[PDB]
Design a protein around this ligand. Structure first.
Ligand SMILES: CN(Cc1cccc(F)c1)S(N)(=O)=O
Ligand SMILES: CN(Cc1cccc(F)c1)S(N)(=O)=O
Length: 171
């Protein structure tokens, strides 16, 4: 059976319990923690691409008020469809399964300034989603897994000083 497991789940959960935040910048900022997954049950002989996108979690935005994240207003119009292609793509099932797949180079941005960056709206919550695309498939089969442990609020600056300290402690 195809199984995609989150790596370092106990690290993501220490961010999630505070409410996780990721910085967005004009030029784009790498994530911490990095999304990494283990994969089993692909065809080792087949070729696949790995794609990453970010699904908007809410019909509203968030605000950090008195040390608490609370509903913060109506949402901005949805960020454009941005998909990140894992740079090892396309590659054999055996390649994806032999070691964890790490999205270490994806950059989150608040400006369409090119460079394969993912545009997100500040003070909106997102959930990472990985797609596995089979190459040369006339049915264009895709699989999609969501990672609820990895939800975060996009910010231009950290709101929670405990997040600022955790990012420094573990990174
Ligand atoms: C994708 N699903 C079916 C499946 C995945 C992999 C191998 C299988 F033999 C069956 S799912 N989301 O569990 O319905
Ligand atoms: C031992 N912990 C920290 C950790 C740091 C960096 C990467 C990790 F996979 C785990 S933990 N799981 O929070 O207890």
């Amino acid at each position: 059976e195809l199984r995609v497991g989150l790596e370092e789940s106990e690290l993501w959960l220490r961010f999630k319990e505070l409410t996780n935040e990721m910085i967005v910048t004009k030029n784009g900022r790498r994530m911490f923690p990095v999304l990494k997954v283990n994969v089993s049950g692909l065809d080792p002989n087949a070729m696949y691409s790995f794609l990453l996108d970010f699904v908007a979690a809410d019909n509203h935005r968030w605000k950090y008020v008195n040390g608490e994240w609370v509903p913060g207003g109506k949402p901005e119009p949805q960020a454009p469809s941005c998909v990140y292609i894992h740079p090892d793509s396309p590659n054999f099932g055996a390649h994806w399964m032999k070691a964890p797949v790490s999205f270490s180079k994806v950059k989150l941005t608040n400006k369409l300034n090119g460079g394969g960056q993912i545009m997100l709206n500040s003070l909106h919550k997102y959930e990472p989603r990985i797609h596995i695309v089979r190459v040369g498939d006339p049915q264009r089969m895709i699989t999609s897994h969501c990672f609820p442990e990895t939800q975060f609020i996009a910010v231009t600056a950290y709101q929670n000083e405990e997040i600022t300290a955790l990012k420094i402690k573990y990174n």
